[PDB]
Amino acid sequence: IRLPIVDKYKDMGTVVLGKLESGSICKGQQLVMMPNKHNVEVLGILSDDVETDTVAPGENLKIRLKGIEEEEILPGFILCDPNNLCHSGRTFDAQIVIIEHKSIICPGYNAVLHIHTCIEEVEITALICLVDKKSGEKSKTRPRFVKQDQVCIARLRTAGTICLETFKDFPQMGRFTLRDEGKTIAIGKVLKLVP
Amino acid sequence: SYNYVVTAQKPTAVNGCVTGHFTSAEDLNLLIAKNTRLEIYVVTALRPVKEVGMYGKIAVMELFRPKGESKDLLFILTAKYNACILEYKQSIDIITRAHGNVQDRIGRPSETGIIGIIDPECRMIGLRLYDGLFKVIPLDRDNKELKAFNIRLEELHVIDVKFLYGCQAPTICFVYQDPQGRHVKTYEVSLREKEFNKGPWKQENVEAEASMVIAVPEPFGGAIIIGQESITYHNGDKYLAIAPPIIKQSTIVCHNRVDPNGSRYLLGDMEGRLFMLLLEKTLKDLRVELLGETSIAECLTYLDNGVVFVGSRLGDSQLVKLNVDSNEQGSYVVAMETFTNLGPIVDMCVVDQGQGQLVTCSGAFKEGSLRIIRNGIGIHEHASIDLPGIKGLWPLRSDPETDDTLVLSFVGQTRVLMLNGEEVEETELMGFVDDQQTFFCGNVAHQQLIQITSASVRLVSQEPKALVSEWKEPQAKNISVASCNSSQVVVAVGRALYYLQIHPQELRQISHTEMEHEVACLDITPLNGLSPLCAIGLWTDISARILKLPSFELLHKEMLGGIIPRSILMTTFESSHYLLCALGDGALFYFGLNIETGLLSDRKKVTLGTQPTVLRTFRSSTTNVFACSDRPTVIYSNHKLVFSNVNLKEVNYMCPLNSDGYPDSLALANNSTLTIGTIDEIQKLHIRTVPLYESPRKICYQEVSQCFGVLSSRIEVQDTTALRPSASTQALSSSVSSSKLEEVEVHNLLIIDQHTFEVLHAHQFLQNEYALSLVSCKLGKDPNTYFIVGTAMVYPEEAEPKQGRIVVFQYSDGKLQTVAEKEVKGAVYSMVEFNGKLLASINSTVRLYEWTTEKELRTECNHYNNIMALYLKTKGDFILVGDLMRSVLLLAYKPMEGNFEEIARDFNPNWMSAVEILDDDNFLGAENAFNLFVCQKDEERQHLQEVGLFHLGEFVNVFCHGSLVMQNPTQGSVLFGTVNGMIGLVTSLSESWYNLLLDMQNRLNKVIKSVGKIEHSFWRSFHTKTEPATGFIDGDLIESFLDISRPKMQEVVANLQYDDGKREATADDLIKVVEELTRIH
Amino acid sequence: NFDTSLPTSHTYLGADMEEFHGRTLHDDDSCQVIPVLPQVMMILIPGQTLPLQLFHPQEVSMVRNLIQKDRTFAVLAYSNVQEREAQFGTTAEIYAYREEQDFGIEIVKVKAIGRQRFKVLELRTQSDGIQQAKVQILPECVLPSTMSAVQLESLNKCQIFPSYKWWQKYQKRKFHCANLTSWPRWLYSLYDAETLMDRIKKQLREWDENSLPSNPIDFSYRVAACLPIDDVLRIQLLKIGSAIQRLRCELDIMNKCTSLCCKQCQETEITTKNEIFSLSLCGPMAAYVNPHGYVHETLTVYKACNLNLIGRPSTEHSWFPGYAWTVAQCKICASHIGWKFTATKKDMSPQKFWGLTRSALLPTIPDTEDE
């Protein structure tokens, strides 16, 4: 199971919001809540308006949490099954089709990284390869600057901390948008998580 | 481009035949349908009445007797869906009562094709036009005007539909197929409501290949069902089924009722074998009995007395007596009359040294036959007699009426034959000298006879016969030339001549002149009683002169350049007076003569042969001219002299006859035989018939060995032993290309002699070889002329052809040499003589061979096309390449390269069946739906324009350049053959004349009556898409300006502007024009 | 062996879209106006399925609309040297359509299908970039039986019939009237629809395991998607109206053009006739789209000479489900040819194969003789 965390309204004990993306979530089902490792117990589901004590994916939940951390949970955390739970860290590699730019993004660039719910600042540290988007020719040599239209795999270090997934391992969670000055500037997938 | 069409020979093939009462309810008629033509006959112990031309391919023909009418009425439906009912009037006029085009908007035609049927009650015609729709025309007098309605069929695949006799409401009955098998079903027609209502009976599955449904009269009622193996009868819940072995070997296609009762029925075979069917009586059993071989019957029609008209499309149509007592010859049928049939014209060629005649591959299978077709005047030989060396001939009148006496001359002699019916006999005629060469005799005035000899001009008595007065040269020499009439004689002696008068008991002298040089030909023929002028021709001055009588004063001396005059004459045609002057070299100057004034002028010069020519007047009742030479020649007339050849080998001399035995006749003498017969009135086409008993498939003429090469195909069964002797199992010399080291098609190159039409040699190609092309030609620099064949190799497993041959042959002495070969990697569709080089189509390629000294084919130059090079023709450097898909390709050899180059092309998807070149720029061809079209040459030059379409109505197989009149308005010529056996022709007009002769047409259509009231400008509109013809001119109309009455002409020519340096038109200006256009066949 | 249905429903794109069972043809010779997207080069055969992903808005704006009405758009046969002289083309009907706003950018998928060939009259440029097209329709010219004109009017009743001897009992009974013509049974067959297809049917059975149309018109247009021909050739096929004419100028191609060389250096063999095979039901080659707005009329051949590889086997956006592609290219000139497909499971057949994009192939006739 997985659940992005969109916001935490402080009522009764504590609550939160988000689209339930993975795995059905029982009443009083023991789950984990990520980038801090925290234990929590399900008290009250408020699926949309209604309360169904179970609720499968693709449904908008207002979950009422009970754990150590009651607030000091942010948007950009998730809820996890305690067995095979969520990766995180703060470095990753990503295919990055650049979509809008007046010249040349060029290593050491500073942009924001809209992942699922999380919104944090990021830098593309170095770029790995380019792609001839015709075929998917994994570029021979190392690029030294990517332009518009043009696809590049590259390594990002967010200045804080995320909770990624690899695309494929997980779709909805991996898809993300770099976003400078508001204009989406690339959409990308995340392939591999660096330490 | 602007062209002109015309039919030389009307189509010959028989679409349909039907018995009925149509001219008269007393009379009994056969009505024959020759495609666009409709023949009516009358039965006797036949006699014609009226043949008439539809503007349509008769698609259904049925007579039927509506209630309360005097005689049966005929219904014609055509191929562009034209319908009409007809009546015969007696002066004679076939009259369209009803008419109309029943063409629907939506539909795809039935695969079974058009089946029109009337009900026996005279209620409705039934037209199974499109798939899944039974059209009905109801026989009330309100349907006069085109008006009909369809009904829905469940069933699509309908093999055969027929109305059922003996039912109280109209009943149709039909077989139909579906993935559950073939079933026979019946519906009752519900006219009032417009639908079908469940019929009396229906059977499950009949015979697999059951394709015919007879509907039997109302002693019995119901229907019979034919197939391959089974004839099956059905009415109500009766079921008869015999599977005779005596129809195993082939199929049943045509049938007819013999006697109205419907006991007896004719049944014809796809391979001829005429059978009768019996219905034993109600109904009990069936019996079939061999009757015999017929011509391959398309349709059958029993008149009475045991006589039958067999119509056929392949071969000659028959009239067949069938007895009840069979001969040991074989069986029960005997051939009475052979109706010629240029059945499938498949190839043809032009021949012969002038004019030219026409030879065709013709018919198929056992009917297959060459045809020789020639354009001249016929003569019915009553009397031939082996009698030699006749150098002069004259008739005589031994008792005043009717000739009874023929006088004959031989060098320094004479004799006499007296006529007593059909028996010629020796005689002596007192006062005639039997031992000097007679130069003229005949009857004369005052009841007398006049012989004229080398010596003596001898006037004789008729009442007790005896010389009464004789004339001699004052000094007693010989007379050289002698010319008489009724009264006056003008004999010549070498270099001077005399003028006698006939009186009683007295010839009397008058005028003795002296000429410039010695005279050769004389005539005195008169234009009142006695001729005051005279025709002369001189030996050195070589000069036709006209002299005055008594005086012998000159008047015109038109000096021809030269050889010596050999005769001369003044006669009259229609109402203008001419002078002719036939020479030795065989030319014939023909002039315009003035009785009164004396002048000649308006010369014309023609040639009649390299033999001296002999000019003779005669009647048969206007005044003709019979010339004598190599090529016999009758002259007549409509105000343009018409020189027509005559169907006989040289005539040296002739004379008119008019005896108590041979009236209005003609006696004529060649070097060996005396012939007496009666001539026919105007020149027709005559056809020589060369029975092969196997299918011909190509033809050509090797001039320099007076023989035809002919590819052909017999049929044989498997062990390979044939059915019958054909024109390839019986030649003099008989070769083969390989030894002995269900049907099958054996190919043979025949060789045929252009005189005898025996089969000299019958070569036999390989096993599983197919003979495609054939040609006679000289090649390279070499004076031999070879007979080249091209083949393809036909294995059934292989779907294209992988290999073939270009086999040169030679015909020398009495044998057929196999000179060279070239194995080829495909199919030799077409080959052609081209600049002394062999040029061949092979699959998708045009290959050009040279002919090396070593006597082989080296490939000069190669060129690949997209179109399967099926068609090929050429002129100059240019090549025209056709494929079955109307895709056309113009190519040019360019010598200074050694390469072919594409000049032009055109690809409009349609079926093609031949093409031609008319000149550099234009290309005749016959695309689908019996059509013509012509493309024109003039970056974007490589597009051949569409510049003419027309709806012919005949399936063209072959075009070849040529004519059927002497050498000598039009430009060019192109004959064409045809499946319907028709022969046509094409020629370009100049622009000026296209104008009038279109303008003309419109006019004639308003005036002219169409058989079924079908408009001319639709018939001759192209069909599948549909458009009205441009660039052509139906001559077959133009011409029919002459068979209309004199008022109707005036009508036509009402408001025109005739072209001569130009004023208001007369009928007499077009009469002229239309005749100048009956003289190209 | 896998399932021969998965590739042709293009399951790579996006689970389920919004299908349109709707019809919308234009009666023949009709003078209609149609719009044509920028970017999409390709000559589009009728019957042939064309997927498409469309990025720019102008494109989307056009698409999103053409969902309320026709769902048909045009596609212009280009010969490159024409130069805005697009003279023919084809009507592509949208039988499918899903769009999704959830990635973080406007995206569209469709699945079109050619409907009618046509002639270009005039091309007019709205300033959005999209064209509209003054367009005559082409019909289908369909000749009746060769032996129609000349059929015998008593031998019409056995024109109809209820292993390969049947073909020898077809030709002798169908073209019997050949005799009446200037030509024999076996020729008229080389132009006979029924027979032609059946010869093509044999040439698709060596490609294995087949079912398909009865109407030749459709059989022609079908097989034409399978023929891996260059640009300028592809055209002649389209232009050729008659099915017969088409059926033929298809069989000339299957039989002659054995070698598929590389289209850059020209003489560098890459595969042969022998080594083509039907993976998709639509045949070996069909048109698939990649995740950037490109098309690959791409061929399924067992082996192939003269190829490098680069990268490593990936199953990202694999048209083929359960296979995995690796980029291939010319040894010589380095230009791209296709993708080498490798299996993942160990109980699938063609354990390896080669998908080759058409834009990289050049059918050649062996030898320097007929060539």
Ligand SMILES: O=C1CC[C@H](N2Cc3cc(C(=O)O)c(F)cc3C2=O)C(=O)N1
């Ligand atoms: O089954 C297949 C064969 C490969 C083909 N691919 C994948 C691909 C990926 C990328 C990328 O950068 O992610 C690209 F730019 C182009 C292609 C391409 O052509 C495909 O579509 N599926």
Ligand SMILES: [Zn+2]
């Ligand atoms: Zn290359």
